[PDB]
Amino acid sequence: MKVEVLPALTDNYMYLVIDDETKEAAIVDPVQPQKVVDAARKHGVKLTTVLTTHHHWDHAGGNEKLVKLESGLKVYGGDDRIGALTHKITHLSTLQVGSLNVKCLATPCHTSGHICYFVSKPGGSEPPAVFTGDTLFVAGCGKFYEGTADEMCKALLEVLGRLPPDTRVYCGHEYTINNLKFARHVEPGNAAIREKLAWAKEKYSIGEPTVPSTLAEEFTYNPFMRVREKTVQQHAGETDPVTTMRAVRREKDQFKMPRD
Template sequence: MKVEILPALTDNYMYLLIDQDTREAAIVDPVQPQKLLEIIKKEDVVLRAILTTHHHWDHARGNEELAQLLPGLQVFGADERIGALTHRVSHGQELAFGTIRVRCLFTPCHTSGHMCYFMWEDDSPDAPALFSGDTLFVGGCGQFFEGTAEQMHTNLTQILGTLPKDTKVFCGHECTVRNLKFALKVEPENEVVKEKLAWAKQRDDEDLPTVPSTLQEEFLYNPFLRLTEEAVQRFTGRTDPVEVLRALRSHRDNFKKPKERPNPQAMLAFDWGLFGPFLEKK
């Protein structure tokens, strides 16, 4: 499977998934359709499906235009507010891209209809991939716009946090530097946070993406996955994991705003074996 990381807008990411044998493709969150169409033409692929994480305009805005331009395009998502939706998916539902399997993981909180997509290939040594939208970020988590701390705690600990530790995390935004600056405030003695922040700053200076991370790495520096750590509890003044999470999100919401920076122009590709034609599993 070939995954192309496509920067969009100010700090969004679209992800183009390509079957290198059939030259068929799917896209996660195509907010800038014209940019996507240029890449599709350059790569000489046929777009078959859209996987939408949630209805916010900076993730789903391109759905209607693409559906009009490409008749027969399948649009998957979990929220009726998603434009051009053709297939409403539910938690645990599995889809297939040829030999690539997709499991839909319902993670309501950022929006009430947020869906993540976990992908793997049977009998492959390659690591699986998680397209986490605005639920899990590198070093952070999404804001609780339409949900609660209890929901996000379930999302992070029981749904995403239990995935294989080598899972590659492809999130919806490039906000790693500011997430890790906050993580360092929470755990000023955490050497892994310091190292990751230095790395992320260098990537940022070079306009290069910081995705993907891995779930294993996230448990070392992401405070929202470290709710039982003494330093995190001390920072929040709480011990109950849900209350620690609630306090962390409140502190993060009030954390200083970063200076605007140019959109990264890099586009990276990761080859993970074959990525077959997109078919809904019956």
């Protein structure tokens, strides 16, 4: 399995997911379709499938155009608002991309039809990957546009959180530096936050993406994944994960980003 990161717009990421065995490929959130076709031609792969994390235009807005550029595509998604949808899927729906297995995970909160895609190789030895859209970012999470704090706790701690620790996390946006500046405010004594922030500023300087991260890493530095940690609860002034999540998300929504 190979994953190519394709920057789009100002700070979005699309992902070309290649099956090494058949050379069949999938594209996650193809908002700039000519870049998708250029990348598939560069790697000599056959695009067969579109995996759409949610209906927001910055993720699904290129679907109509892509199905006119390329024929025979199967467009997957969990919401009727998604453009050019052909296969409506739900929690635990499965499909194949060549030899790769894909499992759809419903993570409603940022939008009510959000789906994360868990991709693996049955019987293989390589680590799996999870395409998290605007549910889980590197050191952050999506704004709660169509959902509650309880729903984000379920998505992060029970659905994504119970996946293998070595799972590679490939999110919707390049928000890593600002997410870690907020994390550093929540937990001033956490060294993993500080070292990941120095690493992210170096990657931004050389023009390289900050994805993927891993689920084990998210549990060390992401305040929203750490709502069961006493430091985060004490910062929020709460004693359970749901009220803590609600408080930390409201605080980040109003936070002024420092310039360093």
